[PDB]
Design a binder for this molecule. Structure first.
Ligand code: K
Ligand code: K
Ligand code: K
Ligand code: K
Ligand code: MN
Ligand code: MN
Ligand code: MN
Ligand code: MN
Lengths: 487, 487, 487, 487
C-alpha cells in the first residue's frame, strides 16, 4: 500500500527482467524489406501494423511476405501481421490548379458535396466525400481540417449539399486532407464496401488481427466479426476508440470485442486534447477489468522521427501508458515514415523495462481480484490462483499450455511479476498472443500423459531466455488443474 | 483504495475546480514586453523564469520591470521572478565561416581547448571552454554534444589540450552547443565567479527564487545560501537535479534545500533517457515526503513551439507529472523561443485541471501521514489536521494566515482537495508561495483580535474566485489553533 | 493493518496507562454504607447503579446519600448515581409453606393468574403477576422460569386465567422468580404507573442516568424522555436491549436515545444464548458508529460472587467487551449480593487496562472516520481532527472544555489513545461523563480570554494523575477552534 | 477492511454452515460408558481427553475401549483419544488426624519436605513433594495453595528442607492440594518416571495425541518426542502453556512442537489472571502464523457443571476463543465431573457456529499470506492458493487427499470459509485431523489414475453433509497440483 514508499524506492536502472510489453510497429515503404524488418524485430518489434489508409494491395501484400521473410532469415520471436482499417474518414476535394493553396484568413465560405467541384475546388467552395454531413451536421457545429489545423463554425445549411461556413482561424486551404467532426453522430459505416475487401484480403493473407478504425458502437464490432467470416473467427478485433460515440459507449462495446486501442490520433482531434489524459487511463483500466488486451498508440516518440533522441514527454509517456495498464505500445510514423525506426523500438523497449520495475504487483493484483469475484470462470479462477502462487513462492515463471490464448490472457489480466510461458501447438495463437502483456509464446509440435514434454519445452525454452535457473520454482496450468513443481 | 474503481470512474472533462498547480514560464526576447507578459499571465502564467545562460543584465533587467510592468497594467495573480543560474556547463567553440556545419559520419577527429580555434573550429578540430576536461576525462569516456544528439568515444588523450575522439553517431557539427560529460567527475563549482554576481544581481533586483543548475551536493546549496547573503535569506533555493552526482546524493541534499527541480534536460543527457521515468517520480515522491516544493521542467510541450497543437505524449506528460506529485509545471523554449506561447500555458493549464480531478485525495493523504508521524512539528500537526477537517465536512477552502509560507506549504504537503487561501501582509511570501501546490496567496495590509478581518479578506477574496458560496464550510489556521467556522 | 502483527505483539502486562473504561457497580444492602462505598470507589467504581426491581424508596434513598456520603468522606473521582427501572416484568407467585420447593421432573401442570394462589402456590398450580399472558400467549409457546433455568411448553389455554403446561426440563419450583416470554408480544408498557414515580423520585433525588429496562421501540424512549420532564432533560436515557423487539428495531431506537446497554441477562433468556455473542458486538459496533455510549452488563464476574478469583471466561470477557467497543463495564450481583465486591471492581479494572493496550487505535480511528464523513457536525469534525493531532505528535492528553458533554463524547467516539481531560463548571456533566469511554472529568468554578485558566486546571489536574510530564504535548478544544500547544 | 461494517452487519442466528471447530471433551467416571459417550459424540464431541492426573490404568484403559465402543455402536465422526500428562505438579502432604483442617489466619509457619511429616502434617509444618523447591525458591517468593486460594510470602530458607513462611491470607489448611510457584524456575522434568510410562501406555493403547502439561522449554518437547518412541512418531505433541517459563520461551518451543494448548487453568494461577486475556490471543495468533494447531481450554462453561444454562461470559468466551484463532475448544470438569455434559458440548457447539459467521475470511486470509511469503513450502503455496480459489469462485468445499495431515492442516492455516474435506486411507490421520480447524476427515480404502475415486468419496461424503449441491464448485489438491472442477 505504501505508494509513497513504493515511489521513494523506485530504484531505477533497467535490470535483469525481460520486457513484458509487446511493441507494435507500423511499416512504411522505407521499413518494407527483410534486413530492416529484422534489425527492427531484433531490437524489439513484436507485431507489425499496416495502415490500410494508403497503399495498393501490392503496396501491402509486399510488407507481409517480407515480414514472413524476416521470419525465414531468422525466426526469433514469432511475429504478427495486423490490418488497420482505413475507416470511414473524410477527405476534402482537390484544389483546382493542382497544388494551388488559397488562404482563408477568418472569412465566410461554403463547403459542398457535389463532386462537380471535386477536382476543381478552393477558396470559394470546398468538396467533402461524406455525402451526408449535411444531415448529420448542424449550424453551430465546428468542422476541423487537416490534423484539425483549421476550424469552421457551421454558419448555415444551404440546400442539402451546401453548408455556409466560416474559418474560425487562419491557414491556407490545400487539397485532400482529413475532415474531423467533433460532436457529430456520423452514420458512416465503421466498415465500407472496400474495407470489407481489405479485411477479406487480410483474412486470406493470414493477418492475425484487425484494428477497426472509428468504431462507434457494438454492432460495428459484430459486423466486422461476420464480415471477417468463418475463416476469420480466429483473428482478433481490436476496436479503435477515436471519437465521442466510441467513448460514450465503450462499455457496451468492450463487451463483445477482443481488444481495444486508444486511437490517440483522431481521438485527440475528435474530443478536447487535455481530456485524453483521463479518457486514456480510464479505457485502459476498464479494459484491464474486462480482461481484454488494450493498446496505446500514436505520437509516443513522434519527434523520434526526425531525431535520434526522444523527448522527455515521450519517454515519460511510453512508461506511463504501461503503468496505466497498456498491454502493447505502438509506433506509427516513427517506423512507417521516420529516419530512426531502429532507435524508436530501441527507446520504447528500454523504457518499458524501467516502467515495469515500478509497478505494484502485489497490491495491483489484489485490487483486480476484488472486482466481481463471484464468478469467476474456472479458467479465470485458476488464472488468478496461479498468479498468487508465484507471489508466494517467488516463482520465476508460469508456463501454461493453450490454443485459444484464453488461459494465458487471463493470467495476463492478473499481471504476474514473472514471465508467462505459453506452450502451444497452434501457430496462430502463438502469434496473436503478443497481444496479452507478459506472454512469451513458443510453438511446440508432434502429439494428457504427454503435457510434461510441452512443459519441458517451455522450461528449457525459458532457460534459453535465462528466466529459470533450475531448482527455481514455476507454476503450470492445464486440464483444470494448476501445478507448482520445481526446476 | 479502489484504484481500479478510481480509474474506471475518472469521469473526465475539466469541471468547476480551479487549477491548483502553478505554471512556470521562461521568457525570451519575443515574450519580453508587458502586453504579451499579460496575455501569458492571464492564460495561467504564475511564475516567470529567466535563464541566465544567455543575455546581458540589460537583456534581463528588462524582463523584470516588464513583468513588474504587467503587474502594473493589471495585477491579477501576484507574479514571481526567478533567476536560473548559468551553472558550470561546457559550451563548444564556433564554426569557422560562421554557421558552417561540417558533417561527421562516424569518423575520428580531435577536440581541443586552445581558444586559438575558438572562433575558427570545425570538422578537423573542436573547441571546448572547459580547460580541464583533459584531466577529468579518460580514454573510453563518451562525450555528448548538443542535447546529447552526438556521441564521442574518447579514443585517446593527445597533449593536454588535445583529445583524440570518434563520432559514435552521425549528425553535422555546429557552433556553440552544450557538452555533456556522462560519468566524469567535473571539478567546476555549482557556482562560478560570475554566478555569484548573477545571484547578487538578482537579490538586488528582488527576484524571489533561484534555480541553481547542476547541483551535486549539499555544500553547493549551503554555498549558494550564503552567497545569496543576509538580504537574500527570504529567497528560495530550488536545487536542479540534472546529473548522477545530484541523484546519488539527493537525500542529503533534500535536507538543507527549500525546493527541488527535476532538471529533465541535461538529466536526460547526463544519465540514460529511459531511466528518467523512474528517476523523476522518485525525486518528486521523495520531495513530497520531505514536504519541499518540487518542479517538473523541460520539453513538456516542446513541439508546441513550432505548432499550436501539442502531442499526445506531451499532454499525457503534463498531467502525469502532476499525478506524480509535482507542485509546479515549467515551460522553457515554448515561451522563450516559441511561436505559440499563449497556447502553451493554455494547454498546460487545461491539462492540470483534468489531472487533479483524477487524484486520490483521501488515500494519498493517509499514506502521507503514515510516514514519520512522531513527531511531527506542531505546525505540521495542525497542517495535516486541518486538511483532515475538510475531508470530513467537505470543506471548500482552508484559509491560513502566514508570513513564512510555512503553514501554507505544510498543508500543501497534505494536498487538500480544496483551495488553500493564504492571507498575508508580507508581499514576498505571497509571490513565492506559488511554489507550493494549491496555495492561492493574497496580500493584506494595515495592522490577535484582528485576524478575523484577514480571514474575511481571504473569504471574500475566495468568493470572488467563486470558491465559497456562503454557508459553505472552511477551516482557518493561526496562533497554534485551528478553526472550522462557516461562511 | 497487521492484525496478526498487532496480535503477535500484544506484549501483555498492565503498564503505565490509566484505565479508560468506567466501571459500573450495582449496590446491595451489604454494599450500602460509606466505608464500603469508598473501598469500592477507590478500587475503581465510577458509577453506582440501583436496581429498582426491589427495595423501598427508603431502601434506595439510603444508597444515594450514602454514595453522596462517600463523596464527602473523600471525593476522589466524581461519582454518578443511576436509577434502573423495574421494567414491565412477570414475577411468579410464592410457594405455600414459605420456601417449600416442589420438584417438577418433566410433568404437566398449570399456570394461573388468580392471586387466590399468589401466596399459596406450587407443584400443582403456579401464580404469575401478568394478568394478560393468557391473551398474549398461545399453545405452543415456551415459557421460561428464573434465569430461564426452566422451560414450559404451553400445552393449552384453560379458562382465561388458566394455562395447561409441561416442564420441558427438570428443576425444583421456587417462589418469586422472573418469567420470560420468548416470542410473545407483551402488551405491558416499557414504563408503568409506578416506574413513572421511580423516575420522578430519581429526578428529584438528582440521579444522573436511567437504564430503562425492556425497551421495545423508539416511542418508549420518547415517553421516558417526557416522563422525566423538564427538570430531567439533563439526565441520560440508557436504553436496555433485552428482547427481540428491542433488537429487531435497535436502529430506529438508537436514533433518539442517549445511550444503550446490552442487558445481557434477560436478553440471553429472551433470545438464544449463543446468539448473544454476535448480538452483543453488533449493538456495540452500531452504538460506536452512532457515537452514543454503550454498556456491557451482567454475569461478567458472576462467580466472583461466591469466590475471590474470577474464571477464565469472565476475565476473557471483561476484556473482550472492551475490545468490541464498550464504553462501560457493569457489575450486578457481584456488588449488590456478593462476598467479594472489592475484588470484583479490582479484577474488572486490572483487566480493562490490559484490554486497552491491545486495541488498534490508529486503524480503528480511520475506519470510524470512513463512515458517513459528509458531514459531519462541526463539533465532530473538530473532535475527529483533534484525535488525529495526538496520533501524529504522540500527544499525551486532549483537554476539552464542555458543559453538554458533547465535545468530549464525540472525541470519545474517535477513541484517542490518551486521556481525554474534560474541564467543566457544570457539576452534572462531570458526573455523567464517565459514560463516554476515556473521559476524565474535573469540575472548575468561578468565572473567552479566561479558558487558559480552565486549561491550566486540566493540565495541572492531568499532572496529578501523572498524565503530563511538562514539555509533553496536548491538544485543546473550545470555541470552534482546536489547540495543540505544549506543557 | 470495514471491521465496523463487518461488525454492524454481524447478522446473527446460527445458519446453514456446519461447525468447523472441533470440540474436545474430558471424560469422568460418570461420562465413562458408550451410551453417554454417544449422546456426547452425537451432540458434537470430536475428541476425548483423559486427564492422567488421577485414575489407574484400569481407570483409564476403560475409557478408551468405551469410546472405541461408542465408535462401534455408531461410528459417526471418527473420534480421537488423547492422553493428558499428569505433569510435574505439587501435592502438599496430608493433615495428621485425616481430614483435620487447621486454620491459618495470617500467621507465620514452615513448609518442609521431609516425608517424616508426609502423612502427619498441619498448622505448624507442611509437606511438599517437590524435594527441590528449597533450591529453586527464594525468600520473597509467594507460594500458592489449592487453586491459589492461599498465599505464602517466603520469609526465609531454614536448613534445606525447611522454609520459613507466612500466610499472606486466611483459609484453613487441608490435605493433598496443588502447590503453585509463581515466578520460580522449576527444574522438574516436564516428564517424570511415571509419565514416561503413561505415554508408553498410551502409545501402546493407540491414543492419537498427548497434551504435555507444564512445558517450560523446547528440550522438554524433544524429550517427550523420543520417549514416545518410533511407535509414537505418528502421535501429536500438544504443548501446554501454563507458566512463565513456557511463555517467556513460547517462540523457540513453537518451533519443534506439533501443536499448543493454552492451559488456562494453572496459567491463570501461575501468572496474573488479567494477563491471560492478552497472553491468550497472543499465543493463538503466534500459533496461527506458525500454522500449528492451537487449543483453548478450561473453565469455558465452568458453571455449566452445576447448571444447565451457561453464563454470559462463558458463551461470550467460547465464541471469542474461536475469533482469536483457536482450532479446538475444550471441556474439563463440564464433562468429567458435571451434571449437564450433554448440554455443555451442545452449547459450545451452538456458539461455535455463530462465532464463525462473524469472522472476516477474506481479510484474515490476506493478512496471513503477508507474513513470510518467500517461502513458502510448495504444499503451503498450493494450500494458500487453493483457499484463494474458493474465495473467488465462491467454492463450497475443498477436498484434499492426504496421509500426513500436512496438506489439510496448511489449508486450515489459511482458514477457508468452506468445509475442508480430507480423503484418506490412513485411519490415524483421519482421527487426529480434528486438530486442524475446519477439516472434515473421512477414511477411504482399497487401492495416480485412481484419485478421482477418492475425490468422489469426499464429494459424495460431502453431499451427505449437504455441503455440495452438484454443479457447485470445489477445489481439489494432490500430486503438487491443484484442481478446481465442478460437481
Ligand atoms: K488507419
Ligand atoms: K540554466
Ligand atoms: K431492572
Ligand atoms: K493434567
Ligand atoms: Mn484515427
Ligand atoms: Mn539544464
Ligand atoms: Mn434484565
Ligand atoms: Mn494445568
Amino acid at each position: 500500500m505504501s505508494r509513497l514508499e513504493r515511489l521513494t524506492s523506485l530504484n531505477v536502472v533497467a535490470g535483469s527482467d525481460l520486457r513484458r510489453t509487446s511493441i507494435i510497429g507500423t511499416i512504411g515503404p522505407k521499413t518494407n524489406n527483410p534486413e530492416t524488418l529484422v534489425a527492427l524485430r531484433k531490437a524489439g518489434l513484436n507485431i507489425v501494423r499496416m495502415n490500410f489508409s494508403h497503399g495498393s494491395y501490392e503496396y501491402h501484400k509486399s510488407v507481409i511476405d517480407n515480414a514472413r521473410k524476416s521470419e525465414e532469415l531468422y525466426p526469433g520471436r514469432p511475429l504478427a501481421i495486423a490490418l488497420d482499417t482505413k475507416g470511414p474518414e473524410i477527405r476534402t476535394g482537390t484544389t483546382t490548379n493542382d497544388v494551388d493553396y488559397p488562404i482563408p484568413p477568418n472569412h465566410e465560405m461554403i463547403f459542398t458535396t457535389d463532386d462537380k467541384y471535386a477536382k476543381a475546388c478552393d477558396d470559394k467552395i470546398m468538396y467533402v466525400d461524406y455525402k451526408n454531413i449535411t444531415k448529420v451536421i448542424s449550424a453551430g457545429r465546428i468542422i476541423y481540417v487537416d490534423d484539425g489545423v483549421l476550424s469552421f463554425q457551421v454558419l448555415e445549411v444551404v440546400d442539402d449539399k451546401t453548408l455556409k461556413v466560416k474559418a474560425l482561424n487562419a491557414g491556407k486551404i490545400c487539397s485532400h486532407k482529413g475532415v474531423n467532426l467533433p460532436g457529430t453522430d456520423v452514420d458512416l459505416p465503421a466498415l465500407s464496401e472496400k474495407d470489407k475487401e481489405d479485411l477479406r484480403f487480410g483474412v486470406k493473407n493470414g493477418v492475425h488481427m484487425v484494428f477497426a478504425s472509428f468504431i462507434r458502437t457494438a454492432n460495428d464490432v459484430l459486423t466486422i466479426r461476420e464480415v471477417l467470416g468463418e475463416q476469420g473467427k480466429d483473428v482478433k478485433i481490436i476496436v479503435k476508440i477515436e471519437n465521442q460515440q466510441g467513448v460514450n459507449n465503450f462499455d457496451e462495446i468492450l463487451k463483445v470485442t477482443d481488444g481495444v486501442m486508444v486511437a490517440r490520433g483522431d481521438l485527440g482531434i475528435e474530443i478536447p486534447a487535455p481530456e485524453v489524459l483521463a479518457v486514456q487511463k480510464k479505457l485502459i483500466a476498464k479494459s484491464n477489468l474486462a480482461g481484454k488486451p488494450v493498446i496505446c498508440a500514436t505520437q509516443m516518440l513522434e519527434s523520434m522521427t526526425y531525431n535520434p533522441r526522444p523527448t522527455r514527454a515521450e519517454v515519460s509517456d511510453v512508461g506511463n501508458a504501461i503503468l496505466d495498464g497498456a498491454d502493447c505500445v505502438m509506433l506509427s510514423g516513427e517506423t512507417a515514415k521516420g529516419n530512426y525506426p531502429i532507435n524508436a523500438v530501441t527507446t520504447m523497449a528500454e523504457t518499458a523495462v524501467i516502467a515495469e520495475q515500478a509497478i505494484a504487483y502485489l497490491p495491483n493484483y489484489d485490487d483486480m481480484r476484488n472486482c466481481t469475484p463471484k464468478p469467476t470462470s474456472t479458467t479465470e479462477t485458476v488464472a488468478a490462483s496461479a498468479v498468487a502462487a508465484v507471489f508466494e513462492q517467488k516463482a520465476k515463471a508460469i508456463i501454461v499450455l493453450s490454443t485459444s490464448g484464453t488461459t494465458p490472457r487471463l493470467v495476463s489480466k492478473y499481471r504476474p511479476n514473472c514471465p508467462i510461458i505459453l506452450v502451444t501447438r497452434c501457430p496462430r495463437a502463438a502469434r496473436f498472443s503478443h497481444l496479452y502483456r507478459g506472454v512469451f509464446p513458443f510453438v511446440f509440435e508432434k502429439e494428457t500423459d504427454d503435457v510434461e514434454a510441452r512443459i519441458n519445452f517451455g522450461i528449457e525454452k525459458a532457460k534459453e531466455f535465462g528466466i529459470l535457473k533450475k531448482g527455481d520454482t514455476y507454476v503450470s496450468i492445464q486440464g483444470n488443474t494448476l501445478q507448482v513443481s520445481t526446476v
